[PDB]
Nucleic acid binder design. Sequence first.
RNA 1: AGGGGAUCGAAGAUGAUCAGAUACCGUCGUAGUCUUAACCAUAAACUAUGCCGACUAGGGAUCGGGUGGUGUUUUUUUAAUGACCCACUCGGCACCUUACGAGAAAUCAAAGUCUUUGGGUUCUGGGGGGAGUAUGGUCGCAAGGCUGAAACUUAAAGGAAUU
Lengths: 25, 96, 81, 87, 129, 121, 94, 206, 216
Amino acid sequence: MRAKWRKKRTRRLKRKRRKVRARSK
Amino acid sequence: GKGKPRGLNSARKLRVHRRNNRWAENNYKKRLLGTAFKSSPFGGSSHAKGIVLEKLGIESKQPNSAIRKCVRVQLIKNGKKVTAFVPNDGCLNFVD
Amino acid sequence: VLVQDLLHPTAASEARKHKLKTLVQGPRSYFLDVKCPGCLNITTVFSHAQTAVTCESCSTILCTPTGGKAKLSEGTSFRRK
Amino acid sequence: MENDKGQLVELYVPRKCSATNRIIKADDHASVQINVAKVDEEGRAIPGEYVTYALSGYVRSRGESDDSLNRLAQNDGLLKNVWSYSR
Amino acid sequence: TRSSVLADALNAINNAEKTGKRQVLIRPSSKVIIKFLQVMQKHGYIGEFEYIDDHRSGKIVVQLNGRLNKCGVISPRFNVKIGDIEKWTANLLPARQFGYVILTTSAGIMDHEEARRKHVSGKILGFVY
Amino acid sequence: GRVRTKTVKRASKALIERYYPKLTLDFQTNKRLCDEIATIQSKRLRNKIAGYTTHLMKRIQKGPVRGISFKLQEEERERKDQYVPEVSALDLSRSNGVLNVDNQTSDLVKSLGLKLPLSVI
Amino acid sequence: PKKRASNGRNKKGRGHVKPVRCVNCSKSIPKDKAIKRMAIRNIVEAAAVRDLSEASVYPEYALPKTYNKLHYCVSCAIHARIVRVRSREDRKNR
Amino acid sequence: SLPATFDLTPEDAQLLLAANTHLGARNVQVHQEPYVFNARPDGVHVINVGKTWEKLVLAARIIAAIPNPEDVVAISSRTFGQRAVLKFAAHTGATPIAGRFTPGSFTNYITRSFKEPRLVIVTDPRSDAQAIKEASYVNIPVIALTDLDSPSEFVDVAIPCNNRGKHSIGLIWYLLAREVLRLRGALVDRTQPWSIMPDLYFYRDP
Amino acid sequence: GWVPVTKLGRLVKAGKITTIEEIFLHSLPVKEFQIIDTLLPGLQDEVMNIKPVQKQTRAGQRTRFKAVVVVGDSNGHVGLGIKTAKEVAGAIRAGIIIAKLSVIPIRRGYWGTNLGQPHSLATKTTGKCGSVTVRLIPAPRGSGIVASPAVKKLLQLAGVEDVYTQSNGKTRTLENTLKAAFVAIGNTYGFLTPNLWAEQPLPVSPLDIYSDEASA
RNA sequence: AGGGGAUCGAAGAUGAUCAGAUACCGUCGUAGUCUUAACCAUAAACUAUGCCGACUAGGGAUCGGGUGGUGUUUUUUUAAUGACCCACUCGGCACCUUACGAGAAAUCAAAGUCUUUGGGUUCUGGGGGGAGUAUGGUCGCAAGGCUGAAACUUAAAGGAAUU
């Protein structure tokens, strides 16, 4: 897969993880 | 000058660069961090004892096909689970 | 060139080369003798004067400033030192 | 090359180029040996009395061999005036 | 800017010898430079060198022969001693039959052999062969 | 097509470069001549060579073309090689006894041994 | 690798160049990167000047021309045969 | 050293002046040839006659020093000097290789055109550079009819010359043949000119 | 049946030129292995290995054999031959011919004792053919040959006794390492030892004197 | 957060093509594209080439400046002032043939003066993934920016050229 789209998916996963951590704390 | 300090009083800078660059070595990093003593299942030991939990039948990698007939063990000294493969032929029945 | 004399090269080469590129660094400029029309008022000026130098007793401009050699007045006399 | 005994040791005594004192290699394949015959008061060149100039291949590769030959001839008297030190 | 006068000059002579020219010009004109040139001249590695003396730093014009194969300079002047001068000469020199390593001892400027003859040492300037 | 094979081409040029007095411009007679001289196994082959030689004769009767040397080309070369049309070779003539040169060449010649009629303009 | 000494076009020491749009595909390309063809044609086609002369008011005259500068991108030029690919050695010419 | 007889004689001087030998190339000129004398306002450079004459006499000495005359190799690629080198060979032995030079003759021994020289008088270095490479690979000294714009690469002997025009090249070829013949001794009278008109060397245009 | 095409072949066949030093001093070109094995009857051949190179074709892969060969008596002469041929025997023969045609003298020398016969190189030498840098350094008496098996065989065939060799780069390229050693062994003569600083009379090439026997 | 918001125009609305088309193609169309006061600190931000200083094969053209032309033209046929041509020089964008050399090659007058190893100096990298991820800090309204692993897995991942 293209590095740009992989990076975009990484940013989406980072946002999801940050939201999960914020809702947990 | 090969991109490195060469003055007679740049020994500190050279030593700092050497210390920073040495961390890239696998042996250097492993020796100082002690990952063998905390992360490795054997804890830096050449040999380790355990007890057999159950058998396992993992398949083969590229170009070949065989059932290796391995065994899972639990280390007493660490408490972790380990996969091991018997070296000789036809000893799975011998192992209980 | 395998062999060439850097001790006493040709005067033409030393003249065509830049001032700082010769054997001995020296100014290629020179001073001037100027005579004002009417009254002599002999005095020495410099080639690239960079100023509108006038006579010490007259309002006539000895030379005008320019980027290169300063342009001298048409009526003023020109003499090498 | 000499030893304590005084006898000659090592073979292949090498030559050096006249223009530049660099040893000519045996494996070198870009060098020639210029030779000029000498006349004796009659315009006729006496055989076997030629003078020899050694020219390495490096000066040839740099294209300075002609100037080197003119200098050598002028210095040896084979030539009179084409070569000037001042240049 | 200018860092090592001896290094820049020695590079100039090395480039001139690589080109093949029979003479070269040294710009910086340092006393150590004239000392180095005397060291070459007294041993025959170069020919005649003269120093253009203006009211400024000056220059040098030196005629070379086809006898200087390689000259180099050790920029960090390490304080070599009696013990390590042999290993330094072995490392720098192609052989001990020829080649000379020059160093500033208490007496002055001379080669490694003369320095060992006088039993003195100091900082190391460079190598020549 | 009807492109001649290199073997018959070589045979034809060998015949041309050797037997010009023997070769003629009539096909049948030189075909018989090839029959006598050239030892060719097959009639079609020798006939093709004879035809090629006839074509070459017709072509080079007008003039030489390429790589022939037919025992008369070198005759012409060694005959029409020394022309020397008298004093019309542009040397010390075709003028008023003077050499028209430029100013720099004039200073060059007088700096040299001179002994020449300079006409610098 | 380094297929060409000039990476895109003759852009050394400049950096950013104002871009232009292709004539047909309307693609934005740097001005120097556009293959520019100085097309100088006639608004009367071939074999038509003869018929257009005697059928025109006033004798002779007219004879005008059209002049347009076409900025073709690399892909459009390749497709329209404006510029043709050649060998490695032929690239260095002109 | 020469016995005061190999000097600039007026007859050859006027011949060279009338042949426009001194007129060189345009502003392009290699620094390796300082034979250029001043520069005309039009753009043509002047070559001093004495330098040319000394170079011719030196090349003649080189040619005459070779014992076997057929070791002399003269090759020309341009059509302006084919007849010149042909007549030079006809008068000084040698072998003419005028025309198109087949590569590999000097190095490869399979070809039937093998002839290793002791020197070459290659005329135009640019057009006959392949012959220069062969002579280098087989270690043959090079004498080149160089020009101001002509390269000075792999040239032991350089002949300042104007390589454009049949007249100048034919005249200098004839002169070279004349003085090498005098050196070889067939011409007993060095002062007397050759009894052969130099027009024979120049080729015929049609 | 010799019929030497080159004039030097006729000269050596006439018995006028006897030693390899005569041709090596003047660097006269040689094109026949018969000349080399005539003036050097003691040359011994050795082959390191045979590389089975392949090249893809329309409907298969053509296989050729590359043979790397060395020759030269243990008295100051070495030569290397590289050749790809269809058959291994022909490749070996052609490599032998090339190695014979590529003889180069070696400059020997003393470590600094000045007591007996030469046993090492005069100066430290370097050689690179590709990305391999073979370095030769003088060694004291009794040290021996310290190198790879191939370089050790080459230097024993050369005739030196004590050497110190250091290599950098992909030493796996055996042909490259041998060619680098060849370059260094040929360059060892390029150094200007002070014994050569004296100016000697310049000799003349043999053909000028012996042109009568040449050609014809 | 304001003004403006003519064209283009992510989202979206339709009509095509296709087994499917949420795209490539046709028409509209919000944010945006423009401007003011503040954040964003990023890119193939490339010349994938660090800065300063010395030397090294040639050739032509060009930009800015300077000097000399028994030079041309423009003027007031002729002074100035300019615009041209010839020669030289400094500082730049660069270009062409070659390789004394470098490089694995593509190629480089610098990527040279590095196994004949040292001009001064800063930064970055030690097999490929994991991963520019998690965590610990820091800046930012926000998206995100800087520093930055480990566990685990593999024997090939790669670069240049040849058929």
